[PDB]
Design a protein around this motif. Structure first.
Motif, mmCIF file in Angstrom:
data_model
loop_
_atom_site.group_PDB
_atom_site.id
_atom_site.type_symbol
_atom_site.label_atom_id
_atom_site.label_comp_id
_atom_site.label_asym_id
_atom_site.label_seq_id
_atom_site.Cartn_x
_atom_site.Cartn_y
_atom_site.Cartn_z
ATOM 1 N N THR A 26 0.807 -1.220 0.000
ATOM 2 C CA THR A 26 0.000 0.000 0.000
ATOM 3 C C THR A 26 0.843 1.273 0.000
ATOM 4 O O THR A 26 0.275 2.359 -0.153
ATOM 5 C CB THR A 26 -1.026 0.018 1.139
ATOM 6 N N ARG A 165 -7.405 -6.825 1.513
ATOM 7 C CA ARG A 165 -7.141 -5.390 1.644
ATOM 8 C C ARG A 165 -8.433 -4.626 1.922
ATOM 9 O O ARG A 165 -8.498 -3.792 2.833
ATOM 10 C CB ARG A 165 -6.461 -4.856 0.384
ATOM 11 N N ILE A 233 -0.453 -6.386 2.137
ATOM 12 C CA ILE A 233 -1.293 -7.576 2.154
ATOM 13 C C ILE A 233 -0.525 -8.662 1.425
ATOM 14 O O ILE A 233 0.005 -8.412 0.335
ATOM 15 C CB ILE A 233 -2.637 -7.314 1.450
#
Ligand SMILES: [Cl-]
Length: 263
Positions: A26, A165, A233
């Motif tokens: 991310t 996610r 993730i």
């Protein structure tokens, strides 16, 4: 990099099986993918989607997590570490969610499944989130057959990473429910030998493992908070050609190390 792809191909070759990986970073919205559109039997990693379906339902029913569910000898299946302690009593849906996610209790999973309407309802919940790959076909214990080529009870690494996610870092669930799922997964007791074993000791992990007990199928799905970095993730699925193959959690750890090295 081609380097990371080469390393995953080499790991897979050495392992003798079939490896699926999806990492979402991310920090830069990038992905590292390996067989990420192929189907893999989920085993107990499917408990995350069942628990999340119950959490979604609780957004409009505030008593729900407190609702009592009878546990009977007829409910026992193949692995019931928590439920076996409560036979002839009740457990709340919250307790069943924690038992399923933190101890991989298969009675707990079946109660979450039954509550929301069965496997097709868990699947319909995934579809509502925008996951058109996940399929929960069966209950415990038969969802674990892991027959090569069988699409029942499978998903792809790409899909499960994107959905995890949404569930843990995105807005699939309301704020209270998202926090509850993350707390449950951070409290898992079963994952130290899997993804966590390939990450530095300081990193914080919420994960759900799954070993089907057939074809040496060994999986882990995780949300990861590296020290002073944006979260990741990571999904790692692994299955082997032999019906009685032994589990290979070290393969998941090795994949985790390969795809995070440098972070
Ligand atoms: Cl370390």
């Amino acid at each position: 990099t081609a380097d990371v792809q080469q390393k995953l191909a080499e790991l897979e070759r050495q392992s003798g099986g079939r490896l699926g990986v999806a990492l979402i970073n991310t920090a830069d919205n990038s992905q590292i993918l390996y067989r990420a559109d192929e189907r893999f039997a989920m085993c107990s990693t499917s408990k995350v989607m069942a628990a999340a379906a119950v959490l979604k339902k609780s957004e409009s029913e505030p008593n729900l997590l407190n609702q009592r569910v009878e546990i009977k000898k007829s409910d026992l299946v193949n692995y019931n570490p928590i439920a076996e302690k409560h036979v002839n009593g009740t457990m709340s849906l919250a307790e069943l969610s924690a038992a399923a996610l933190q101890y991989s209790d298969n009675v707990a999973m079946n109660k979450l499944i039954a509550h929301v309407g069965g496997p097709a309802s868990v699947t319909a919940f995934a579809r509502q989130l925008g996951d058109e790959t996940f399929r929960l076909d069966r209950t415990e214990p038969t969802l674990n057959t892991a027959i090569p080529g069988d699409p029942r009870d499978t998903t792809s690494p790409r899909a499960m990473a994107q959905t995890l996610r949404n569930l843990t870092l995105g807005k699939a669930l309301g704020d209270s429910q998202r926090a509850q799922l993350v707390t449950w997964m951070k409290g898992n007791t079963t994952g130290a030998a899997s993804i966590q074993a390939g990450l530095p000791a300081s990193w914080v992990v919420g994960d759900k493992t799954g070993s089907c007990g057939a074809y040496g199928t060994t999986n882990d799905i995780a949300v990861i908070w590296p020290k002073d970095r944006a979260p990741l993730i990571l999904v790692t699925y692994f299955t082997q050609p032999q019906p009685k193959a032994e589990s290979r959690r070290d393969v998941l750890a090795s994949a985790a190390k390969i795809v995070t090295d440098g972070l």
